[PDB]
Design a protein around this ligand. Structure first.
Ligand SMILES: Nc1ncnc2c1ncn2[C@@H]1O[C@H](COP(=O)(O)OP(=O)(O)O)[C@@H](O)[C@H]1O
Ligand SMILES: Nc1ncnc2c1ncn2[C@@H]1O[C@H](COP(=O)(O)OP(=O)(O)O)[C@@H](O)[C@H]1O
Ligand SMILES: Nc1ncnc2c1ncn2[C@@H]1O[C@H](COP(=O)(O)OP(=O)(O)O)[C@@H](O)[C@H]1O
Lengths: 436, 436, 218
């Protein structure tokens, strides 16, 4: 059908906007800025604004996770689109925050989140939507409980927005937007793309490997210096593909008594296989399986052997992918790179200046930046920096902003765990941080 | 006398401004902005504008080299000051460029240098003054041939400025401002101060060491990575103290036939001693006298020996100081760090961020910078950089400015060796250079 | 001022073709496939076929070295372009090989080089042009001695193409196309670009470094 499209990653960071190719909108007869009605899985719908995108495939639609969540679908799934000509300016909408996103937040909610979020934006909303509003170094989720023209409308300047009391509980299928996704990863476009390919069939179409006798990858080794976002990638790939995630921390395993280590490795692979499709992530692999000579222990050599055995003991394995992070290829036992094991490697390098910028935007999404803040500038003075450095930078900048305001606040009493929304991080804060 | 002051270095880079202490100006009854007549040696006079400096001491006057040259005086000499209440707005002045400063310059001298230099500035000038105007990546010197009033006047908006044809020859005592001076050295405050102490008496008061039997330093070893400005320091100290300068380049000596090396070392010390007070600078000392083991030759060992001999053969001498540069203490033969020889060592380190800024201003003095150019910014993104790096940076910036304008210029014909005065180096040029 | 362009490297490997930006041809009112007259240094002219190029800057013209040589200009120099509406199918042209390019060649020059080179191609040529024909693991240069409609024409199927023996000597300013050029360097795009930058001002505008005191790389 022409109205069926494949879900793809957003370029436009605004949660209300989905993107089509110029040709596709032509074909579907959709106006730039039109309100469209999206149909997903489990009888879910979403309403969004449609815009053209030059880079979008003709058969794909780009949407943010917020809308993917609302439609209960994942990247690569199929949605249907159709114009929404009947959509009315809403008389009144009722929204409530999800409890787990508003712990600690002692603000107005309406004045701090909702009012600025909706103001003059003409956002469409549908009853039962969860949307996200960022601010005050948090990101709060709200559920739309009622819209006056039901079940959807446009929040126009005259639309009354109600949020009368009592945060609501999170239902089971409602994944938190605080979960890691691809949108949380900057400057890895190329490698993240490879990893997604490798994993697509095994994790999203597992039934295939029962129907054919072709071998998908089993083990993927992510290498690169500390703080490059290897843990982040693995976690994200799991979340996005809806696979079960099992973390094995090198040091955590090695901290255990001889024997309770091997018992823990075993339990990890068993639990993965039980909950497949699944990803096992082995953080700090070199702690567990260092270069064959670097081990001096005898229990140490037994642990690495136990790991090789466990890798080999993964056949079709239902559909379990093992991902592991390490500093360098040569830091680990070469027997791990043997064929049935870690046979795929991906280099997560130091980010470039464009990547640095993406990372800086990711780690500032929930801050209020002054107008004088130039992230591209901060990008340019941080050549050596990896993701973890940049995140620390933004964190140091923000905490400096807070200290500057803290003497002022203590004196005219201590609003303290508030006023963090009116606070803005200035370029002076970043300079301060950049020289520390 | 209170009209008698010691010549010190300038903080204001205007070559028309001389700075005194509030108290002294009070004492001498001088108005901030007043024209003062300065008297020095060889019956040379100079008219300058007097301002105040918190750092200047009551006994000292701060002036730029331009004015020290005009007064035939050097740092530490004694000048006399007096108000100039009779000074008139000039009717007409006549100036000519010094030939050696205008080779290659195919501009309109008046339109490009003189007009902007004098315009609305109210500069005093005195017949027989040489002044310097910077611009178009050059610095041109002019001599004042005639002033209408008297021997001096103020160049007021109505003063007619003549420069009718024919660059003039440089007289003997007229030192080029293209010579290296302390104003060409950035970010060495502490060390430059030590070296100046060491040579003050030997080079400026040589008659003393005939009257007493105390030993001044003979050899000074400047240490630090390449491009830190060791050659520059030695050259500057020579020029400023009026001493004779003799360069010995390590590689140049070692490039000679066995025997012509030793003959060249000898000729260097002989010529120094003949023209004392003098500085001998040995650039790249480790090329001539490397660690005792690093030499393999037999003629090589003869050269090092020859050097030890020559230096130990310089007692108070005709007042000859020997300076030598090397990367590290340990790179050279320990016998050279002897007691009658290189017994004083001074570390010329990597410059800090303040130093980096001074260097960047030094290497931009003759460029036109756009308003968007922030040198302090360039200072901050060049931590590792040494002076030689920063000079290359400015050079790369300027050449990029020129290339951008070169396509445009070739097309609407090729002013070429001109229009370089209207050209301005932009922050975009520096960014381009900073990422290369 | 609109007809003056900056010489740039060829993308189209055919020595007859120069390339302009789409906008520029619009501006100059030139037909795709038109014969154009190029004016260079030392009162030299060339005639070429003009085609559009999407990647060519609006102020630049792309040409192969053959044409740069004929115009006595180099990359970055300035030429002028203008349409050539009067150009006629030539009755007869006379070409001779340059001696130094034909030592050892004991072939039929016409049958082996000229005939295939001109055949049904509609190449424009101007008296005093040197052109290059490749073949038999060698590349021969020819000089155009005479064209019937003088001084330029199109070599049409009916144009009689004469050699008439006796290779000619190479004049001084006539650089061999056997010389190395950027044309003979593959797979160095990025680095060749850097080196060209470094060297541009010092080598092509040397008069500058007498006028200013900035240091180019050495
Ligand atoms: N590419 C990146 N994009 C966004 N944030 C990043 C990136 N790399 C690192 N970070 C941030 O720094 C932290 C450190 O990264 P981490 O997942 O521990 O990487 P690694 O496992 O390679 O040490 C992350 O949790 C994240 O907040
Ligand atoms: N402190 C400095 N101030 C100004 N220019 C400097 C400085 N240090 C280095 N430079 C620049 O670098 C150039 C080369 O340095 P040079 O004088 O040879 O020092 P070194 O002998 O230690 O290499 C100088 O001519 C000057 O242009
Ligand atoms: N990038 C290249 N493009 C075209 N030909 C090349 C290239 N590199 C090498 N060659 C060929 O191989 C020969 C040997 O290259 P040469 O210039 O001697 O390189 P090098 O100095 O690095 O050895 C060249 O003359 C040329 O024929």
């Amino acid at each position: 059908r022409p109205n069926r499209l494949i879900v793809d990653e957003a370029i436009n960071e605004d949660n209300s906007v989905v993107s089509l190719s110029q040709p596709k909108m032509d074909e579907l007869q959709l106006f730039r800025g039109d309100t469209v009605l999206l149909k997903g899985k489990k009888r879910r719908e979403a309403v969004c604004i449609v815009l053209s995108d030059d880079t979008c495939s003709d058969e794909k639609i780009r949407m943010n996770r917020v809308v993917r969540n609302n439609l209960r679908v994942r990247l690569g799934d199929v949605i249907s689109i159709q114009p929404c000509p009947d959509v009315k300016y809403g008389k009144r909408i009722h929204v409530l925050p999800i409890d787990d996103t508003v712990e600690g937040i002692t603000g107005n909610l309406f004045e701090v989140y909702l009012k600025p979020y909706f103001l003059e934006a003409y956002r469409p909303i549908r009853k039962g939507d969860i949307f996200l509003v960022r601010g005050g170094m948090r990101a709060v989720e709200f559920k739309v409980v009622e819209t006056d023209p039901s079940p959807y409308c446009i929040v126009a300047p005259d639309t009354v927005i109600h949020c009368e009391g009592e945060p609501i509980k999170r239902e089971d299928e409602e994944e938190s937007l605080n979960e890691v996704g691809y949108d949380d990863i900057g400057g890895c476009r190329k490698q993240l793309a490879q990893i997604k390919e490798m994993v697509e069939l095994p994790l999203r179409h597992p039934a295939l490997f029962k129907a054919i006798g072709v071998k998908p990858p089993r083990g993927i080794l992510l290498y690169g210096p500390p703080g490059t976002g290897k843990t982040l990638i693995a976690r994200a790939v799991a979340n996005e593909t809806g696979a079960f995630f099992f973390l094995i921390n090198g040091p955590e395993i090695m901290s255990k008594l001889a024997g309770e280590s091997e018992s823990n490795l075993r339990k990890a692979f068993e639990e993965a296989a039980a909950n497949a499709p699944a990803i096992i992530f082995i953080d700090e692999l070199d702690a567990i399986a260092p270069k064959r000579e670097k081990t001096h222990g005898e229990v140490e050599r037994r642990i690495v052997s136990q790991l090789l055995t466990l890798m080999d003991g993964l056949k079709q394995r239902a559909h379990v992918i093992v991902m592991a992070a390490t500093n360098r290829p040569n830091s680990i036992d070469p027997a791990l790179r043997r064929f049935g094991r870690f046979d795929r490697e991906v280099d997560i390098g130091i980010p470039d200046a464009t990547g640095r910028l993406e990372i800086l935007q990711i780690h500032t999404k929930n801050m209020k930046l002054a107008d004088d803040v130039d992230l591209e500038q901060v990008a340019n003075e941080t050549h050596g920096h990896v993701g973890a450095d940049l995140a620390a930078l933004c964190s140091e900048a923000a905490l400096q902003a807070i200290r500057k305001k803290m003497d002022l606040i203590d004196l005219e009493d201590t609003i303290d765990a508030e006023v963090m929304n009116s606070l803005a991080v200035t370029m002076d804060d970043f300079r301060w941080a950049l020289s520390q």
